């Protein structure tokens, strides 16, 4: 189900923020287990020394959808890996398209 390479696992929002900061590469991203919201994943993104987090959860239809800023419809993907692949291009309702996968101890 959770077939993601950039899955740090159970890490506080601070850890994910410090991780991207250390990288120093825009477009970088990772995954974290929302503490306040158990069961939901958060996709962090590096941009101008910032960490944008998006709500990624699996619906009852077995699909993965991302929740971004208003005015942007949430696309439904069949696989979680397909989500990250779609965010690898402009025009996706985000601050910046992924460009530097923050591998979890596999760089």
């Amino acid at each position: 189900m959770d077939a993601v390479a950039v899955y740090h696992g159970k890490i506080s929002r601070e850890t994910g923020e410090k991780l991207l900061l250390a990288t120093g590469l825009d477009g970088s991203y990772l995954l974290r287990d929302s503490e306040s919201v158990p069961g939901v994943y958060c996709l962090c993104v590096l941009y101008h020394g910032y960490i944008y987090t998006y709500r990624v959860s699996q619906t009852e239809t077995g699909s993965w959808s991302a929740e971004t800023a208003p005015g942007v419809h949430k696309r439904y993907f069949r696989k979680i890996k397909n989500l990250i692949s779609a965010f690898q291009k402009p025009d996706q309702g985000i601050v910046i398209p992924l460009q530097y996968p923050v591998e979890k101890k596999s760089s």
Partner: peptide, 8 residues
Amino acid sequence: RKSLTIYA
């Protein structure tokens, strides 16, 4: 230190 997270 301040706020490196912005969420969405």
